[PDB]
Structures are given as C-alpha cells and as structure tokens.
Design a binder for this molecule. Structure first.
Ligand SMILES: [Zn+2]
Ligand SMILES: [Zn+2]
Lengths: 122, 124
C-alpha cells in the first residue's frame, strides 16, 4: 500500500535502482539492481540523511531508529540483483526511511553510490 | 526545527541546490541556488514523486501551494534566492519530504523539466 524508490549514483562506476514496498506495518520488500560493482560482497545500508550535497559522505551515519540491510552480492559482471525482505524498514510513521539515503559500500558489511529514498506511485 | 535539502540535476546543463527549513507548522524558508539556466524567469515547482528513474518525467505532476512561483536567473545563468512559503510542510500527512522539486524551461504557467531532485532529510 506504500512504495518508495532510490536511484543510486556516486563518485564511481557504480549505479542502480532500489524499489521498496510495504503494506501497513508489515515487512518491507526491497528490490535491488546495482551495476558496476567489483565482484563479491558489498555492504548495503540505510543512512541517516537524504543529503547528497557533498556526494555520499553528506548522507551521514548508518541509520538507527535496523539500518543494516546486510550484504548484497555482485556477480562476475559487477551486477547485484536481489530481493530482500526486512521488518525494520518502515515507509510510514516516526521512523520512516522516506527522505533518508540508501548507500552501497566498497567493502562487505568507501561509499561507491547512494540515493535519496523518494516516494513513487502506489 | 526541521530541515530538508534537494540536489537538482537533469538532462540539461542545469544543476544546483535547494535547502528548506520550517519551525513547527510555520512558514517554510526555501534557499535556492541553481546554475546553468538561461537568463530570465523559470517556473519552480513541487512535483508529486521523488522518483527520478525516468529522469525528471517520473516525478509525476505538479503537487499541491506546490507552486513556488518563479525564480530569476541572472545574466550568468545563476538563480540565487530565498523564498518564504506557507504551504510547504516538512512534517505531517502533507510533508513534501520524499517528493520532488523541479525547475522548468519556461516561466511559471512551463515547458521542459530542466532539473529536479528528491527532497531529503538533512541535519539539525
Ligand atoms: Zn554505511
Ligand atoms: Zn512543474
């Protein structure tokens, strides 16, 4: 019943799209497609601020109302495509992640790419 | 007591930064700095979706009020201005957080969507 999207870019080759969906206070479904990554595990995190005025560093710290989505895996071609299901990522209420940032890291759980979490049509 | 920011980019030379600040449910202060504009008036709008998957077109329609009016680019293509608007909430059901700010090719009704950015949270 509620949806969000983040377009990831940064000072690097890495880019992609993340779509988030949640019904009520239920679990949040995260659909990840990120390209240009070095093969292997990459930390993938909610960060506190949807502030990209200074690249990905201006998004501040790992976000804790939880914010740890774990690793995503890039394949031999630098593509990470995966669907995660997380309970600690609300799109509504006081702890909404709307307007915050999604950040993908150089190393496993160095901010290669990020995007503001924005509203998108239901 | 609450703040947001949008970094504007698009399929054009236009880019820049907009900060928003609001105490309580009072008036919203909007600081604008956009560069690479043609000299003259440019429509400056809230649009409904912070969705840039299809460039600025995916931000959907102007959203309400959501008409911030015009900004003025100077001879060097720079538009640097502070606006005060009462209908741009940063809290509550109508919050514009996670929506989009869009700067237009033409003066406010507006032609091409030159640049846009998602409205995101920023500290303090
Ligand atoms: Zn992180
Ligand atoms: Zn518009």
């Amino acid at each position: 019943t509620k949806k969000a999207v983040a377009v990831l870019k940064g000072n690097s080759n890495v880019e992609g799209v993340v779509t988030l969906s949640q019904d009520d206070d239920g679990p949040t479904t995260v659909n990840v497609r990120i390209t240009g990554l070095a093969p292997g595990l990459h930390g993938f995190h909610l960060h506190e601020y949807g502030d990209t005025t200074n690249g990905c560093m201006s998004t501040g710290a790992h976000f804790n109302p939880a914010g740890d989505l774990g690793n995503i895996v890039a394949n031999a071609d630098g593509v990470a495509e995966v669907t995660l299901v997380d309970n600690q990522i609300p799109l509504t209420g006081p702890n909404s992640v709307v307007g915050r940032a999604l950040v993908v890291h150089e190393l496993e759980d160095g901010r290669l790419a990020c995007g503001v979490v924005g509203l998108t049509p239901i």
